[PDB]
Scaffold this active site. Structure first.
Site, PDB file in Angstrom:
ATOM      1  N   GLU A 137      54.581  23.010  -9.528  1.00 53.86           N
ATOM      2  CA  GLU A 137      54.628  23.905  -8.352  1.00 53.86           C
ATOM      3  C   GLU A 137      53.687  23.381  -7.274  1.00 53.86           C
ATOM      4  OE1 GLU A 137      52.994  27.921  -8.331  1.00 53.86           O
ATOM      5  OE2 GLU A 137      52.184  27.650 -10.418  1.00 53.86           O
ATOM      6  N   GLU A 170      51.547  19.310   0.316  1.00 54.07           N
ATOM      7  CA  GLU A 170      50.537  19.149  -0.772  1.00 54.07           C
ATOM      8  C   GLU A 170      50.745  17.839  -1.519  1.00 54.07           C
ATOM      9  OE1 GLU A 170      50.256  22.808  -2.985  1.00 54.07           O
ATOM     10  OE2 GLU A 170      49.394  23.838  -1.236  1.00 54.07           O
TER      11      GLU A 170
HETATM   12  N1  LIG Z   1      47.731  14.746  -9.071  1.00 54.84           N
HETATM   13  C1  LIG Z   1      47.420  15.905  -9.686  1.00 54.84           C
HETATM   14  N2  LIG Z   1      47.206  15.878 -11.021  1.00 54.84           N
HETATM   15  C2  LIG Z   1      46.903  17.044 -11.621  1.00 54.84           C
HETATM   16  N3  LIG Z   1      46.809  18.267 -11.087  1.00 54.84           N
HETATM   17  C3  LIG Z   1      47.071  18.268  -9.768  1.00 54.84           C
HETATM   18  C4  LIG Z   1      47.374  17.143  -9.009  1.00 54.84           C
HETATM   19  C5  LIG Z   1      47.564  17.603  -7.663  1.00 54.84           C
HETATM   20  C6  LIG Z   1      47.428  18.952  -7.672  1.00 54.84           C
HETATM   21  N4  LIG Z   1      47.093  19.366  -8.951  1.00 54.84           N
HETATM   22  C7  LIG Z   1      46.874  20.705  -9.397  1.00 54.84           C
HETATM   23  O1  LIG Z   1      48.089  21.411  -9.266  1.00 54.84           O
HETATM   24  C8  LIG Z   1      47.799  22.829  -9.183  1.00 54.84           C
HETATM   25  C9  LIG Z   1      48.664  23.454  -8.105  1.00 54.84           C
HETATM   26  N5  LIG Z   1      48.397  24.870  -7.854  1.00 54.84           N
HETATM   27  C10 LIG Z   1      48.748  25.844  -8.892  1.00 54.84           C
HETATM   28  C11 LIG Z   1      48.885  27.189  -8.179  1.00 54.84           C
HETATM   29  C12 LIG Z   1      48.486  26.898  -6.740  1.00 54.84           C
HETATM   30  C13 LIG Z   1      48.891  25.420  -6.560  1.00 54.84           C
HETATM   31  C14 LIG Z   1      50.412  25.305  -6.353  1.00 54.84           C
HETATM   32  C15 LIG Z   1      50.859  25.790  -4.970  1.00 54.84           C
HETATM   33  N6  LIG Z   1      50.123  25.155  -3.856  1.00 54.84           N
HETATM   34  C16 LIG Z   1      48.691  25.384  -4.042  1.00 54.84           C
HETATM   35  C17 LIG Z   1      48.178  24.806  -5.352  1.00 54.84           C
HETATM   36  C18 LIG Z   1      46.274  22.942  -8.939  1.00 54.84           C
HETATM   37  O2  LIG Z   1      45.626  23.433 -10.106  1.00 54.84           O
HETATM   38  C19 LIG Z   1      45.848  21.506  -8.595  1.00 54.84           C
HETATM   39  O3  LIG Z   1      44.502  21.245  -8.942  1.00 54.84           O
END
Ligand SMILES: Nc1ncnc2c1ccn2[C@@H]1O[C@H](CN2CCCC23CCNCC3)[C@@H](O)[C@H]1O
Lengths: 625, 303
Positions: free
Chosen positions: A423, A432
């Site tokens: 997501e 993002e």
């Molecule tokens: N390369 C990476 N490897 C691992 N983790 C990653 C990434 C890039 C992003 N993340 C994580 O993904 C999640 C996304 N979250 C979850 C709810 C809110 C939201 C989605 C909607 N938009 C706002 C962020 C977060 O927890 C990030 O930290």
């Protein structure tokens, strides 16, 4: 429940008049601060030497009453734009005098009329006043929906009324206002008191006005009808407009004389209250959005930045999103594992960006309803959220490292996946950096593995909003480009605005992406048919996503997933507002640009005139890889 | 003796009736209380001394205009948006309200009794012009002909259905209420005052905001004289058979002109704005003027 003042042009005693009006149920009184017939000379002897108090004393009310209860009115003889030199100068002097007294009394607002075309000198005097001393009166510019000249009775025998469809004609009063606020440089102190008449223009005309800063709508007693019981009420068309104006928490002003003399007075008010207690109630989205209306925010960069605990909590309290993820995964588990294969086939599911775990529980919920078996990995890079996961892991679960604290682009996966679930979408879908994050995780998706989501598409639509243009200027910061605020997007619950053309698709990304290049850079040309005279202040952005097959999420207004809280629209500004005529095409160009360190958007308008290219080289705005 | 104690500073109206008595109306246009009064002086030369007057009364609000209606009756244009009828009691000691009707949406600026004395027209900052039945105490008609404030209305001398109006929309309308479209436009600087000739059905004067007085024939453009250095507030024809024209103004002067608009008298007796003028019916060359300087002045006009 609804806020309303009384407009009077006659006040014999301030205290008796305020008391009568407070009794009637009104919250404030627009009244003159000098007697509306007491014309004053500033140049010629002997009337310049007229003795005596020039008006009544500040001591007649408390400071609290002046500050909360009273809107001042410019004297109706003051004509800064008169073609007679002596009247122009007396009027200049007299306008500064009345404005200075309003500032002296600390009035919260002051009403000036726009009742003709040429208000250049009015503008220039009000601008000088705004730049003189330390005062914070709002200026309510009283402008009619319909110019008086256009609602006169056709009773002049040798000057008939222009009959057929006059198209820029019943838009004259918007151009009065627009020329005035452009002269005054979109000052945040200059708003609109929109005066309603017996007849109304186009839905389009009324649409432009609702992108303008309306603080007050003025209702004349004369435009009200009578019911059977003898009470005042309104046409079904006037009721529509109220309903729209209430959706901007504007103040209502009742002007003119009592015309319902069997029924007391406060009844006009009673009727506004009646209409107000009787609109459709806020939906779930409207209740939650209350507070955020035209508040500009920085888009989250969850790749670059470790989200706060309370940020995750708003993204988690979005049941319809997780409900749709649950179904998409269910439908996927059914297409992947035949019924014979049920208990032998363990599907490998990896959650990429697991945060504090709601997609993990969605994957579980999915597995029970589809009755297939899964092996779960949860990859998160934010070590703060990893604490929440690893505590849930050690407390529940007990079986498997499940949680892996890693960037999905570095992680060595024990094993290839059947399904990657993510997501990683913002308000503009790909802002993002979902594309880069999934391209880097792709290598551990099985050769026939599914990505949920499989697709997303950003959408754009041109908009007018002089409030939103000012919220953007207000973003000017010391120690950077004085124009940097206009070369970056803002997540914003767009409220006081006009959508000038229907949203069209901008950028689309597919996963997995087996094109031997990927190339997530993009150039798109978009042509928007327009149908009002307007200002373009920027482009609203939305997106849609295919999770699986027909299971989708949208914030595009025409397909908006109902009751879904996680994402408000984005706004891309432009530095200079662009005039657009009815019939004209808005042409816009968007690029998604990148290097090994950063992704950004550049954008330009090429029709009906060119803007500068905005955000060249991400000089003002980048999204960190 | 008889009435309210303090007559307000800003003298708006003065009008002689048949027997030579003086009607004064006034507003307070500054200070705590923004209201109005009416006065009868059965001796002009005393006025405006309250003690030594015959009758007077407090109105709810300011007096912007008024006119005599026959002998007993006083018709008032109020800041309150109301048109008021007051009348003298049999002893002409008291002034009683017959009606106060709130029918206009802003200040009533101008009022004028028709031909027959049975009907009147008002004009207002609300942009509307209204024809009243004074016995039935109701509006008979309401016209939104103008595009801005109505500055002046003036009933024709001899025809109940005819009057002039003028407005900040730069229009002078000649009205006949027997036509479907009752108004006709006649050729500006903004027109500020109107009087009919008392001996020509066909003719009238208008004053502009720039100080020019203009003579107009329905039958025929104009003839003009730069008479004042600012707004012409009032034009009142003298009671003689070849009548004089009294012009008053914000330049704080009064002029009296002949029928060719050449200057005969000029007075600078006033120290503020000259609001009204009325010629003695006893002495057709006494002219009485009033102003926001609180002076009632009695000029002998050379004739
Ligand atoms: N390369 C990476 N490897 C691992 N983790 C990653 C990434 C890039 C992003 N993340 C994580 O993904 C999640 C996304 N979250 C979850 C709810 C809110 C939201 C989605 C909607 N938009 C706002 C962020 C977060 O927890 C990030 O930290």
């Amino acid at each position: 429940r609804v806020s309303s003042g009384r407009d009077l042009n006659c006040v014999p005693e301030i205290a008796d008049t305020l008391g009568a009006v407070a009794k009637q149920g009104f919250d404030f009184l627009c009244m003159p601060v000098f007697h509306p017939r007491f014309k004053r000379e500033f140049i010629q002897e002997p009337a310049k030497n007229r003795p005596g108090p020039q008006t009544r004393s500040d001591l007649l009310l408390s400071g609290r009453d002046w500050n909360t209860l009273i809107v001042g009115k410019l004297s109706p003889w003051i004509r800064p734009d008169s073609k007679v030199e002596k009247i122009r100068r007396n009027s200049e002097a007299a306008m500064l005098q009345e404005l200075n007294f309003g500032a002296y009394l600390g009035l919260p607002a002051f009403l000036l009329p726009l009742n003709q075309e040429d208000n250049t000198n009015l503008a220039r005097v009000l601008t000088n006043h705004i730049h003189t001393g330390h005062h914070s009166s709002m200026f309510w510019m009283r402008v009619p929906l319909v110019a008086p000249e256009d609602l006169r009775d056709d009773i002049i025998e040798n000057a008939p009324t222009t009959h057929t469809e006059e198209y820029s004609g019943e838009e004259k009063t918007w151009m009065w206002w627009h020329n005035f606020r452009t002269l005054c440089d979109y000052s945040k102190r200059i708003a609109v008191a929109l005066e309603i008449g017996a007849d109304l223009p186009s839905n389009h005309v009324i649409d432009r006005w609702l992108g303008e800063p309306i603080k007050a709508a003025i209702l004349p007693t004369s435009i009200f009808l009578t019911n059977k019981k003898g009470f005042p009420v309104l046409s079904k068309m006037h009721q529509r407009l109220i309903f729209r104006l209430l959706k901007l928490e504007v103040q209502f002003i009742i002007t003119g004389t009592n015309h319902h003399s069997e029924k007391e007075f406060c009844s006009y008010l009673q009727y506004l209250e009646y209409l107000s207690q009787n609109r459709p109630p806020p939906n779930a989205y409207e209740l939650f959005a209350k507070g955020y209306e035209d508040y500009l925010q920085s888009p989250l960069q969850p790749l670059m930045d470790n989200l706060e605990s309370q940020t995750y909590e708003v993204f988690e309290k979005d049941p319809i999103k997780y409900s749709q993820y649950q179904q998409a995964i269910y439908k996927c588990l059914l297409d992947r594992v035949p019924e014979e294969e049920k208990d032998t086939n363990v599907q490998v599911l990896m959650v990429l960006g697991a945060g504090r775990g709601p997609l993990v529980n969605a994957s579980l919920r999915a597995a029970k309803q589809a009755d297939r078996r899964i092996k779960l990995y949860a990859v998160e890079k934010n070590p703060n959220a990893v604490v929440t996961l690893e505590n849930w892991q050690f407390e529940e679960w007990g079986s498997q490292v499940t949680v892996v604290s890693s960037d999905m682009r570095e992680w060595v996966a024990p094993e290839k996946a059947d399904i990657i679930v993510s997501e990683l979408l913002g308000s503009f879908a790909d802002n993002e950096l979902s594309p880069e994050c999934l391209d880097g995780a792709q290598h551990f998706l099985k050769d026939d593995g599914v990505s949920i989501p499989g697709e997303y598409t950003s959408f754009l639509a041109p908009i007018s909003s002089s409030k939103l243009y000012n919220e953007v200027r207000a973003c000017r910061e010391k120690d950077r480009d004085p124009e940097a605020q206009f070369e970056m997007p803002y997540v914003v619950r767009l409220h006081n605005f006009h959508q000038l053309s229907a949203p069209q698709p901008c950028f689309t990304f597919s996963h997995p992406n087996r094109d031997p290049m990927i190339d997530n850079n993009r150039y798109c040309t978009l042509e928007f048919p327009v149908e009002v005279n307007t200002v373009l202040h920027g482009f609203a952005g939305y997106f849609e996503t295919v999770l699986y097959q027909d299971i989708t999420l949208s914030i595009r207004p025409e397909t908006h997933s109902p009751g879904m809280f996680s994402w408000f629209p984005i706004l891309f500004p432009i530095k200079q507002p662009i005039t657009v005529r009815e019939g004209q095409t808005i042409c816009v160009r968007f690029w998604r640009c990148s290097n090994s360190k950063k992704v950004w958007y550049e954008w330009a308008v090429t029709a009906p005139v060119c803007s500068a290219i905005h955000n060249p080289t991400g000089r003002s705005y980048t999204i960190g890889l | 003796p008889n009435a309210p104690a303090c007559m307000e500073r800003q003298l708006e109206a003065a009008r002689y009736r048949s027997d030579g008595a003086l009607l004064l109306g006034a507003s307070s246009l500054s200070g705590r209380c923004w209201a109005g009064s009416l006065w009868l002086f059965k001796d002009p030369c005393a006025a405006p001394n309250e003690g030594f007057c015959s009758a007077g009364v407090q109105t709810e609000a300011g007096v912007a205009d008024l006119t005599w209606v026959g002998e007993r009756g006083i018709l008032v244009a109020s800041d309150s948006g109301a048109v008021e009828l007051w009348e003298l009691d049999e002893n002409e000691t008291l002034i009683v309200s017959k009606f106060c009707k709130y029918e206009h949406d802003d200040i009533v600026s101008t009022v004028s009794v028709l031909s027959s004395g049975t009907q009147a027209v008002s004009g207002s900052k609300d942009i509307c012009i209204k024809v009243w039945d004074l016995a039935q105490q109701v509006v008979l008609s309401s016209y939104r002909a103008h595009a801005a404030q109505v500055t002046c209305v003036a009933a024709s001398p001899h025809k109940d259905s005819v009057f002039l109006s003028c407005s900040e929309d730069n229009r002078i309308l000649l009205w006949d209420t027997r036509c479907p479209k009752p108004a006709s436009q006649i050729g500006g600087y903004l027109p500020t005052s109107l009087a009919w000739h008392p001996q020509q059905s066909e003719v009238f004067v208008f004053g502009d905001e720039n100080g020019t007085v203009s003579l107009v024939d329905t039958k025929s453009c104009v003839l003009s004289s730069a008479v004042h250095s600012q707004c012409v507030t009032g034009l009142v024809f003298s009671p003689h058979s070849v009548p004089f024209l009294a012009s008053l103004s914000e330049d704080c002067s009064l002029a009296v002109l002949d029928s060719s608009l050449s200057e005969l008298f000029r007075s600078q007796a006033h120290r503020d704005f000259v609001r009204d003028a009325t010629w003695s019916p006893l002495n057709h060359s006494l002219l009485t003027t009033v102003g926001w300087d609180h002076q009632v002045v009695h000029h002998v006009v050379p004739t």
